[PDB]
Design a protein around this nucleic acid. Sequence first.
RNA 1: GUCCGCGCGCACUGGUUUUCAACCGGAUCUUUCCUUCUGGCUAACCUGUACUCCUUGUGGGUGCAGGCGAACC
Lengths: 81, 87, 155, 129, 184, 151
Amino acid sequence: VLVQDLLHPTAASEARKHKLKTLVQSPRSHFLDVKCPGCLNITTVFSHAQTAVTCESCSTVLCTPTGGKAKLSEGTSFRRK
Amino acid sequence: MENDKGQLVELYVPRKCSATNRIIKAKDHSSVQINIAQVDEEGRAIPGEYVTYALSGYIRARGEADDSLNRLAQQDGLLKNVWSYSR
Amino acid sequence: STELTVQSERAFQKQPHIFTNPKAKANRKTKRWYKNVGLGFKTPKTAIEGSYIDKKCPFTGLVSIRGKILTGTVVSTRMHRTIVIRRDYLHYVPKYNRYEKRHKNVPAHVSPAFRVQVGDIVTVGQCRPISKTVRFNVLKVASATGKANKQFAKF
Amino acid sequence: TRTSVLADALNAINNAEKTGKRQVLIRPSSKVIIKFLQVMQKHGYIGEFEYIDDHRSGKIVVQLNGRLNKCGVISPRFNVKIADVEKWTANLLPARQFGYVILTTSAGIMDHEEAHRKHVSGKILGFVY
Amino acid sequence: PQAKILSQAPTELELQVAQAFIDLENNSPELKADLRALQFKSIREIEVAGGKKALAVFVPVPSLAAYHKVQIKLTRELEKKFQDRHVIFLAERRILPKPSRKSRQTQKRPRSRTLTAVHDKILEDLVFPTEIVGKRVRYLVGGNKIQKILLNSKDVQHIDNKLESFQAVYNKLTGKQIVFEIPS
Amino acid sequence: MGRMHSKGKGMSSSAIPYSRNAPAWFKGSSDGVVEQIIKYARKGLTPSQIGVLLRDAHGVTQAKVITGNKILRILKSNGLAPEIPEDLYFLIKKAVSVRKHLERNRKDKDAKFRLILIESRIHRLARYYRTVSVLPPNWKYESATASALVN
RNA sequence: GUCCGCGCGCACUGGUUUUCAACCGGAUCUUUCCUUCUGGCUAACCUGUACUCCUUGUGGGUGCAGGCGAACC
Ligand SMILES: [Mg+2]
Ligand SMILES: [Zn+2]
């Protein structure tokens, strides 16, 4: 310690530290585009989604409530968007 | 420290730390004056020539003296990327 | 205020030495004398158009305004034609080089021309002693509404 | 709560300078802190520092150079006449050869030397020497 | 149709700029059916070091969004037609004075009208294609303030050479010297 | 980390991102999102729930960035603002539920302590809302007006 | 310049655009107002007219209806 660049820290330092502690805080969550196995209708889903996000087309759950990131339907396809 | 007439009334103008730039007391019995002899191209240490670094007692006591001297060596072209300004 | 019926009491209510002779066939309601108290203070229109009498009015009455003028916040209205004004300020204690919150309650006499409710800030002026505790007379009701300008919500 | 943001900034700078660091991170970073630190800088007690906009009150990162020995805020911002500034420089600064009671004048936040020269005084913020 | 899309016609340079705009209005199937209902606010020129020029148009802030939705292609077209001049779209702004306590109360001015937020907006829209992601403010030991701006590494190719142009534009406009940077 | 009624110091929160403008990947438009918010409001969802749904079931990060305006102001400008602010309403609900529970059984004294704590919290929030004039100045909370606002 | 104990580096009077440091300003132009006007009074010259009194050369005046207010009510 005793000599640092708090302004230009290593990206590893950015990743390891808890949010709200970085120089600028950006939520570690993100948004994903997901394909339901039944209908081809793509849907956008928040990473730590709270309520079960059924597609508007059909009663098919895509995420399940969980303390952290929601658990998917084991068949749907997610991509980071 | 200085009189009007133009003479230094202050006595034994003292050194300072080369790492924290802080003053070294007369009886700071931990401060160390490291001397690094210069080296020419073919690998001979030049006698009577060197570079000096006055590490303070406080940094030695805290234990962060080695990192400080890595920094001084790197900034003065004594070592190659031993010390990274980022962490 | 008197509730727009000064003639309510056992005695007549009029401005002394101002009158309208019934013999004059011009029929202007009553000669209503009025004055401007000075210091660049606007006399309200309802003072001229009013029917109250108020010997102690600064405009239609006989009293006068000179000397001290103070601004305060009205705190009590329940007594007739007179007001209780709070005055908050700071007293500098020098032993501590510090300040202390303090206040004084000043009675004042408010003309019927003014509509005063608890919460206003009133610019009041010094006058000839009206009664035992009152020596101030209302001049300007500045913060009449503040937030009461708009009441309801309908977008 | 963080009643005096200026106090927190100076407490951080004092702690780190005592530790012997070269950099500090002031968290809340109001503009009054910016003014105070740039007074320090124009008088050289501090080095190259940086504001970090966060769209929320910002932050500051400050480079030291070991020159600083003591900072400090006078949290109750007492009113000081032009007469009583000498009492305060007696009560705070080690000597009149240097040291600066930083106080806010009608011109702005500024040291007591320029305050005396401008012939103006206001509330008192802190002291640096 | 020159003077009818300019709100007035001094400074013939912007007359020729509007003439080029109309020449691009010939390209109907993709750059029209929306591009006709547009105006300007007396486009003007700023010197740029190295023998270059920066021509800034000014939006009457009706729906700047409309200009931005076509900004990249129209900007590229105006750059291939106009040689040795870099064109920039800016939001013409009526900054309001700060109310001096002795001055008159004027139905309190919105915070969006302040000089600082105006500078924020003008620096945001000085480069629409790249989003501004960081702002650093430093003060040299000489006391002169310098702003660093962190632009995204993605979408940087749309500009890729214009950084000194925006430097000159901002320095001439407001005197706030900038140094641009991108994360690696 | 405050915890105005517990020695706890938790700082669980949400970090609003730096980008003031809308994200580039968003494919909708402002007016469509506004209409969706209005439809959810007419369904009977409180503003926090509407924001949660827009985060979960759609690509809205936060509607303030997208719609250029905050949720409650959107309902208020369109005449859907609740007569009780949502947070104070939920606090009403908690207080009345605890009141009915103590009505059911007496000697649960920790429940009584928590009820007094909730009365403290509601008095604070009601004082705030009354000062900023969002609520009528003669508004109180004693015994049964509570259930009336609940029922 | 004057001078006064090899000299203090001009001891007493000024030029200070040899730069030069300021430190307070004041007035300026910023997309940047100085409470604002209604008239006095316009002070004054953006006046524009008979004109040059004053070397042809705006270095200055005999001089009044559009007109700068900030020199003051
Ligand atoms: Mg504060
Ligand atoms: Zn499905």
